[PDB]
Amino acid sequence: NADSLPERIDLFVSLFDYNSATTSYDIRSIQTDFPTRLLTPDSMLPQTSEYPLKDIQLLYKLAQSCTGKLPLSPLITEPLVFTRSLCKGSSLSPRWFARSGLIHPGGGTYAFRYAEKYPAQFANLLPYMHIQERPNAAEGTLLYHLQNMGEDAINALVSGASMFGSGSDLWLRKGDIYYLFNEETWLTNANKAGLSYSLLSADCFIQRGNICWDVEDH
Amino acid sequence: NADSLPERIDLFVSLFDYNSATTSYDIRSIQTDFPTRLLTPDSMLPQTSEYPLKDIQLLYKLAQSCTGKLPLSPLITEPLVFTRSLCKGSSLSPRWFARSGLIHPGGGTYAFRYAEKYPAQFANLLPYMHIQERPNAAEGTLLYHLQNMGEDAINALVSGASMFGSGSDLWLRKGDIYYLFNEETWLTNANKAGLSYSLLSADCFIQRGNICWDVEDH
Numbered sequence: 192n193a194d195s196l197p198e199r200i201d202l203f204v205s206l207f208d209y210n211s212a213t214t215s216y217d218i219r220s221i222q223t224d225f226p227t228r229l230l231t232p233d234s235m236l237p238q239t240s241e242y243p244l245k246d247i248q249l250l251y252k253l254a255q256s257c258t259g260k261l262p263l264s265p266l267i268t269e270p271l272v273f274t275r276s277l278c279k280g281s282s283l284s285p286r287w288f289a290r291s292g293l294i295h296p297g298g299g300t301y302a303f304r305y306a307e308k309y310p311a312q313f314a315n316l317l318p319y320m321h322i323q324e325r326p327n328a329a330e331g332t333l334l335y336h337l338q339n340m341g342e343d344a345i346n347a348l349v350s351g352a353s354m355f356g357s358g359s360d361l362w363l364r365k366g367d368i369y370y371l372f373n374e375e376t377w378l379t380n381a382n383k384a385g386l387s388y389s390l391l392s393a394d395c396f397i398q399r400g401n402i403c404w405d406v407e408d409h
Numbered sequence: 410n411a412d413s414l415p416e417r418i419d420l421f422v423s424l425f426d427y428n429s430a431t432t433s434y435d436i437r438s439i440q441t442d443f444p445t446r447l448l449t450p451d452s453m454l455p456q457t458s459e460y461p462l463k464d465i466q467l468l469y470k471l472a473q474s475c476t477g478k479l480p481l482s483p484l485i486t487e488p489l490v491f492t493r494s495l496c497k498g499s500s501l502s503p504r505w506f507a508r509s510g511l512i513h514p515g516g517g518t519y520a521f522r523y524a525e526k527y528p529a530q531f532a533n534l535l536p537y538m539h540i541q542e543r544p545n546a547a548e549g550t551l552l553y554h555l556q557n558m559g560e561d562a563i564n565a566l567v568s569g570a571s572m573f574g575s576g577s578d579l580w581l582r583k584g585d586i587y588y589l590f591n592e593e594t595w596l597t598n599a600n601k602a603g604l605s606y607s608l609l610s611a612d613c614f615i616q617r618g619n620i621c622w623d624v625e626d627h
């Protein structure tokens with residue numbers, strides 16, 4: 192009966208009332224309000240695949256002592272400008288962050304680090320901070336849903352997947368808009384289409400018992 | 410990298426110390442203490458695929474009034490014997506339950522129903538009751554693990570799967586023995602083998618986003 196599976200999934204998608212959705216988000220509005228750099232969890236980690244570890248260490252020591260060895264590689268120019276500015280105490284306008292690569296080599300953003308030293312500029316620099324650096328958003332808002340997405344849900348959203356689950360919500364793409372439905376509606380329409388489903392924490396290539404296995408990429 | 414997946418799963422299995430397992434259960438001991446009929450969730454439902462619905466209804470009415478229409482089909486002979494005995498008040502020895510098909514046509518077991526009318530015989534009839542009809546077992550015992558298994562975990566155990574997950578435990582089959590490990594050990598050995606995994610609520614034939622889809626059989 193697994194041969195009719197694609198047809199049943201199409202029937203499943205067609206059962207939803209897209210005008211009675213919980214909320215809906217245009218993909219364009221999501222890309223305007225959140226650069227991909229500010230969604231992906233890897234932006235919160237030290238940028239070990241972009242800078243040598245010794246260069247990241249040399250930046251932290253420079254930010255601590257505000258004197259001494261400057262890092263070498265010419266890809267540290269902008270992070271050096273940022274670090275020297277905090278040490279010299281000179282100001283960086285919100286337009287400087289809008290111009291930057293946003294992500295600091297030690298993980299997180301320039302804006303969040305700058306707002307930790309100058310908390311009066313927090314609100315104006317919020318658009319340049321990672322979602323995981325911003326305060327807990329109000330329930331039902333786009334930021335709230337994004338902050339509560341695991342890496343797999345974020346990756347599915349960034350890649351524009353036709354559908355993905357995130358917690359207690361189903362995200363369904365119709366055209367260039369995502370429609371959210373609660374899991375009760377998800378399960379009801381899966382029942383009617385003759386479907387069962389599972390939410391994955393990775394891809395599934397080999398199943399043993401009730402365990403889906405996958406190689407991790409890194 | 411998905412081509413090396415079977416080799417990585419074999420390495421994963423080989424990393425476990427089977428002598429330092431949480432607990433272990435011989436498959437033979439499980440089959441001795443629990444007939445499959447007393448594990449599968451479908452035994453708790455009315456036996457609609459074995460008896461006509463009208464015959465099940467005729468049995469409930471007979472058990473209520475203790476008079477009137479006897480069901481027809483000759484597959485109801487033993488359930489009729491059981492029902493007439495409760496009505497006549499005659500006793501059924503534990504050996505009668507050991508001889509029976511265990512499962513009552515309305516779902517559940519003969520033994521549990523009999524022990525509801527004669528609670529003094531509960532302990533002697535416990536071996537003939539469904540695991541979901543028995544009291545909550547003590548933690549760490551075989552019955553405890555079985556009572557907390559979803560249908561998918563039960564089906565994997567009944568079918569003798571090489572491995573399956575159930576809650577916070579990994580069940581690993583080596584020979585004819587199942588070895589239990591906590592999920593921390595599961596994840597540590599998956600990390601070292603270069604693997605990611607997900608626990609399924611059904612099979613996975615088509616993946617959309619982070620959702621594994623499957624047709625339900627019924």
Ligand SMILES: [Mg+2]
Pocket residue numbers: 393394405406407408
């Ligand atoms: Mg993968």
Ligand SMILES: [Mg+2]
Pocket residue numbers: 611612623624625626
């Ligand atoms: Mg299946």
